[PDB]
Amino acid sequence: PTSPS
Amino acid sequence: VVDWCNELVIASPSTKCELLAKVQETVLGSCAELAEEFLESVLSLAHDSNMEVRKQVVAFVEQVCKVKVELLPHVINVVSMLLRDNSAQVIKRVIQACGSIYKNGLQYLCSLMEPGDSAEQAWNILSLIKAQILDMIDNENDGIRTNAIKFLEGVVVLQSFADEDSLKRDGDFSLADVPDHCTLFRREKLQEEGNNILDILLQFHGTTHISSVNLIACTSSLCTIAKMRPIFMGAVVEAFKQLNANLPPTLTDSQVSSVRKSLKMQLQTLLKNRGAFEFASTIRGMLVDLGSSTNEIQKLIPKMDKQEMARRQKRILENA
């Protein structure tokens, strides 16, 4: 998932 | 192309690792020629005092047996010499190099129509390098043990017979690839030594005071052996089952979790091999203990024809 979330 | 840029400036203690690096790039790569004259120059640095220029010539000797394998009898007395180096970092580098060196050396020694005198002494040194590294299972350095376990994995694969269920890899070499017109060694003796090394790995895998790194490495080696040589599938599945039932009390809690995650990875790899047909239920049972779901396990089982299942089934009944 996304970085950062 | 006359030996140009003769980079033999010998002054600098760390730059010897930079000259031996650039020398190797052309002498052993670009101009594959004239590698034979330069052998004794780089070889004399095996007696150097520094530990990193010795590891640099191990990378040289290993590249020698790749590009130009008939130099095996010349570049080999330093492999058995640097195996007894007093630096453990040098010993580990030699073991790593011995993986491809023993393979390339054996394929070259096998294709010889008339084994000469240098070929018989070259094979004799390998058989003793093999036996030396096998002794290093009981070495007190944990890094040496890890590397030795990985080396013994390749020997077992080399000195056994492939079959229809073997995982197909590009350069797989088995006992079926050594010919009958070879007098340096016999198929039956290599096969005998391969089984004895496997028996040593299987026993090592089951010891009660094994380190976590060695155990994970040994488990990875047994898995590679079994998927390459499904004749050993029954023994490896049984060793995995005994491990999962009796974890060594020397492992900490996070090492247990590390060992079990790796064991689950190897079990999944084995279940995908058609030679794991007989042991599919045992493998499932362990994967369930290690946290896989029913549907994750089910997806790993390879589809097989009903007549093929009927052949494998009845064959299992005949062997019983």
Binding site: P1, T2, S3, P4, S5 | A88, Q89, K92, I95, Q96, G99, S100, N141, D142, G143, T146, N147, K150, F151, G154, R169, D170, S211, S212, V213, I216, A217, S220, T224, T252, D253, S254, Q255, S257, S258, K261, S262, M265, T269
Partner: protein
């Protein structure tokens, strides 16, 4: 300072790995960083609309793209600050499954990344027979936790760098380090 080739691996090679990369490089370590995801993912106006880019897209370009979409919004959520830091470290995020570089230590920042890294290196045939230690240090994916995690990873690599024989001591070193910090650090070995 100890000639150790270190890699820090996350999902997108955007937040957690670069924070650790930042601190490891300033301490003089031979460090690289990678992500294991299929594409680079960055947050945005909502959960449902993340900014997704292909691995290899320069940090400079991602900076300008986010700058054009909403420059004020991506300054107050810290993404332009993060992109600027990454821009100053290297050109673009790299995928771990594509690299041909070899390391002595690989550090992943969550168990999902650890599994991807292990499955990848096991899917390759061993050639050099060279072992690499794979360590998992859990780091939550936010700015504050990436910072604390980057301290833990840097401290861990520094302690391992001071060993005269890392292979012979790493298990005991991790054991004490774990106990001191009440963490679980998974640790296995893979081969190139």
């Amino acid at each position: 300072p100890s000639k150790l080739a270190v890699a820090v691996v996350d999902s997108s090679n955007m937040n957690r790995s670069m924070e650790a990369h930042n601190f490891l490089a300033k301490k003089g370590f031979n460090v690289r960083s990678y992500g294991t995801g299929e594409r680079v993912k960055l947050p945005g106006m909502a959960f449902d609309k993340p900014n997704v880019y292909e691995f290899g897209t320069k940090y400079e370009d991602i900076y300008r793209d986010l700058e054009s979409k909403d420059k004020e919004f991506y300054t107050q959520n810290g993404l332009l600050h993060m992109l600027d830091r990454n821009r100053r470290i290297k050109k673009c995020p790299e995928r771990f499954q594509d690299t041909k570089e070899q390391f002595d230590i690989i550090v992943t920042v969550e168990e999902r990344v650890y599994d991807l890294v292990v499955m990848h290196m096991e899917s390759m045939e061993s050639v050099d027979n060279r072992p690499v230690h794979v360590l998992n240090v859990d780091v939550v994916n936010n700015a504050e936790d990436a910072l604390m995690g980057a301290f833990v990873i840097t401290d861990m690599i520094n302690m391992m760098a001071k060993s005269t024989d890392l292979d012979n001591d790493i298990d005991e070193l991790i054991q004490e380090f774990e106990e001191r910090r009440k963490r679980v650090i998974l640790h296995s070995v893979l081969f190139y």
